[PDB]
DNA sequence: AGATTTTATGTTTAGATCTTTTATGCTTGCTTTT
DNA sequence: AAAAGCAAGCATAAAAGATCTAAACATAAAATCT
């Protein structure tokens, strides 16, 4: 791979043969144990879904050796998280101080304590969407610098060593291998990292005057091709479907929570009303309450 | 002791057995805890509406049915009256009577956990106001609500919420796994004949149905279920009718006339007055709306000059304004000092001119455009 | 030791007395008729029966009497802008009850009661209710829990229990988990429950309490309208009895100068003590009008232009540059430097030389912290920004006439 | 899904007696691990030597 | 009848939140040299 | 005529600024061991 410049400056039988990939990707496996054990760590950087190869390593493999399983690709965990899964689930040491990278000099302390208490550390896509910041790679770092900390890891993004610099790439003593499954990225995406319909769902739920506050914005959107609120409010009180402003500004406040409407305030004050879909649709919404 | 304290205590507004507007919300609620048994697997729900609705009233009277009482064990936990969003599971082992070895949420979490994974009966965990369950990371409610995909596992859960949108809005990811994500039940709002029959049943259970003829009660119910849709505001201004027309009249039927005066009931300062002149002068002279207290202020000297009345200073002007808010006439958007603070009208001014009531002082403030 | 100190305290069973005075305080007769107006016009002589409140007196007795004799529970919401007579008439409605229910006329009932600036914590009302009830102090947890026990658990013969809150807007937060459960409260069977509440905002349901809360709070209301022009009189003169030592213009001129203001009658029960204490100096035994006219004048007092002329010169010098750098650049607030420019052309108009700009920053910090000017701190000179607080014809108003 | 698969938890412990050398008695009395082991604690502790006797 | 963790509680500080306000940047819409 | 270049415009977002809250830290009530 050694791509051009010119591009910046311009701008089945599938089943059978996953499965022998994956079996030989299994047959790799004590070749990991012998290199885990003179200190090297593991990294795996293929294209599919890594996650049942590592799985497989956690079961077939470290069956009964200490094992803290991290989901990188969880859009929720934190560093905080692992450090005090490691501080109090495997040290019963109690919670781990506030500060993180005191939390690690703690672990290196109490795992210089115990020889040979392993502790293997899997962590499914070290680039994940919590730990792209260059102070959880450096934890992970100083994590996987202790004897007796193994680490395997998963690496699916493309721009991942920007965050590594010479002294975590050292620290890191990666032993990199090309695990290329051709698996789909399931797990990884499913999770939240990566309408005239719904608004006539929540139109149905609402009563008569909410709909008729919500007519008289969508009269006023296809009459004129974001309505002022005064003339909004003129509207109720002529029509009778408010008793006071306070009581349009709630309605307008839940149609902002249900986001029907956007509110984009003016320079001179005035608020204004958008509905925010094309006029067709809107038009079709307005023949539907017909 | 007469009718009229009859009907105004069994208007009550409490809670109640029968519950006429709700029935194909009830056998469908029912239908879901029978199939769910009968099934003897795991099952999520959540119901949700607006305020006033009910959604209480049928969960609290499917949490009393002896049929469920002998098959399931019934828990109901108002979210509110915990101290904390990560100490429900504390409440629950109260509510289970678990042992735990104590004094951390973990702790808590993994005995009930342990207590479903090998439960004798089926769980029913009805969660009231599940919206003080959510946060930001919201670890507390993704936990209570993987309850039911737990391997073995027999909790069948119900979250009780007014938002419509709260299981998607802030639970996106149990939509990537159908076995997790809740069914759905929403409570729409009564309708008018709803409350006509809500009325009918809580008048005909004491007895009391003369004091209210049936075209008071349809003239009620047609601008409670138009405006709202609760029937909390509707059996309120039920009992208003009857303890106002207890005031005036000391068996007469409430007139229409009596409950179009509550509905319509329902649905100043010399220096307040002056300032609300000069704020609507100014509003209407100027496109720019950035009213701050000092230019309020400056305006309002020079008119009470031109009035020979004598304006009050700076200091009393900002109380005065204060008060004024009070009311709802304007709102004040603070800011770092007191001249700063930046005035906003929050009523039209045709409302404010017979607000003020004084048509011949308006008059002369917005005639004088000299003094701006 | 302490800690029986204080068990004893958080157990009740050791009343917080204070100190007596040594010496016995003065008999009655000893007092001047114009020290008997002094002291009936003190603001926490609460009158047996207040005037011009009767129609708010007639509500809330025949709301609370209603849910007296139902016992039923409920909720009522009063609000009114301040010294309008809400939390007297109140106090006087329960009081009337609890007269006419030591005499057998009405069931008897509990009459709790807080306030909800008096508490450091919205939570804290759980702790002070409960210790109205029980009298023990216990943390708000276990205060919560006895109370949930309480009123969700039907226990008979329970009472009918009256729960005045003070001060609604300050128990709200942003979760509102504690009003949503003194307003949840009523709505069971079992608790008796009957809270009134009391704020000054009338739109406080609406503006600021949830949908739900504003739902348990229901449509039942009342509104404390402003005291007139006359019934600020009608108070003065009931406070003051049958007595002449005001006169009746006085206290027409105060009612007058007090109801177009505010409404208070706060205000006007201090405007007639500091007249009362203006007549005793000058040895009249009658509160003629002119001690009225300068009372008002001390009590609404406008004693900025007296400040600028009471400045120093280089300050007034200052004073003139501000107001004239916004009168030619226009925009309000003005940079230091542009305003020492002004201040050297108006001192070389004067004739005095002016200091150099660090005693400028003097001068500035000096008008600063007296708050003639907003400025920022010293640190920045001449690019700190200095706003104008007094009004512009105010100090011309000052340094000319 | 996989039970490791959580939508709560982000970290998930498989302690196995924890308080507070991995390879098997096969691999380590193998005959070609003990000629690795001598040859790579030899020439560490050279350049080991090396390193001080130039920062010395 | 006295010392020791043990636990429940209150305080304080760091972090989440609401809100305004200000800005670079993402895109647009012409605009203009090669 | 082709593709680089200047005002325009909404928009994520960035500061910020108050503001509210959750967890870490100091501390007191108390079973526990002697
Ligand atoms: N269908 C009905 N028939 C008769 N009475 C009803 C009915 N629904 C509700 N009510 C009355 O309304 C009162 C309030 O209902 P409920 O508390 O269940 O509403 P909710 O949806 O729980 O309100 P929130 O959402 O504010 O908690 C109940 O005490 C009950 O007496
Ligand atoms: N109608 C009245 N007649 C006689 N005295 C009155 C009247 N109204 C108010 N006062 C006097 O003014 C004081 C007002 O106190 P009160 O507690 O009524 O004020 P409030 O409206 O509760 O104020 P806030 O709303 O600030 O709490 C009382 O102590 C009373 O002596
Ligand atoms: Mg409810
Ligand atoms: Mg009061």
Redesign the pocket.
Known sequence: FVPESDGYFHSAEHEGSINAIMEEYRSYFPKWMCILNEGFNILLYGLGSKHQLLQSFHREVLHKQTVLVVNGFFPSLTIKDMLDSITSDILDAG?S??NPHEAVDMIEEEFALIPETHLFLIVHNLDGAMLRNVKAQAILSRLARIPNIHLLASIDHINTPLLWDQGKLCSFNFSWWDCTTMLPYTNETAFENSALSSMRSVFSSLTTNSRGIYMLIVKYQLKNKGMPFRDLYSSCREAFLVSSDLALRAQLTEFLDHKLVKSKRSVDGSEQLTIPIDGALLQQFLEEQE | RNKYQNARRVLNSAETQNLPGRESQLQELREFFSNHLESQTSGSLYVSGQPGTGKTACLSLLLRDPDFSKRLQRVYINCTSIA???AVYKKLCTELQLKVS??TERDHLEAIQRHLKTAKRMLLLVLDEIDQLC??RQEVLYTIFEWPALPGSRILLVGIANSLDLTDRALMRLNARCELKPRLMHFPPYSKQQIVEIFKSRLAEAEVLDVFPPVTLQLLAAKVSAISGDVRRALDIGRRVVEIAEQQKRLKPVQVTQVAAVLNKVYFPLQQKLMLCTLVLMLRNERNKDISMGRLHEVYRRVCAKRNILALDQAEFTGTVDLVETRGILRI??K?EPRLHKVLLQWDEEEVHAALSDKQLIASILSDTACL | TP?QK?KKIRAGELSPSMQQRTDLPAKDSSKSELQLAREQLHVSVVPKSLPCREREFENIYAFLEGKIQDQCGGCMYVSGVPGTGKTATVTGVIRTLQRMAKQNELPAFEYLEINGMRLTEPRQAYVQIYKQLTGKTV?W??AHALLEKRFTTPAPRRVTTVLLVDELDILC???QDVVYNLLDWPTKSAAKLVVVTIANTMDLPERLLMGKVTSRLGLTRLTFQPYSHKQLQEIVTARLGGSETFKGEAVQLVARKVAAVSGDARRALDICRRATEIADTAAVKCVTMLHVQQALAEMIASAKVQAIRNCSRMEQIFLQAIAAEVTRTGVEETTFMGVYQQVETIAAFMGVTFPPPGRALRLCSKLGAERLIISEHSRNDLFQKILLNVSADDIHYALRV | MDPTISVSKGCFVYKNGATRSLLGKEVVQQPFYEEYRKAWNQINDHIADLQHRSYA
Do not use: D
């Open positions: 919670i101080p506030a | 904390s969003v990560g104590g004094r946060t930001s958007m603070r770092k | 800690s204080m943390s947890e276990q937060n942003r979760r």
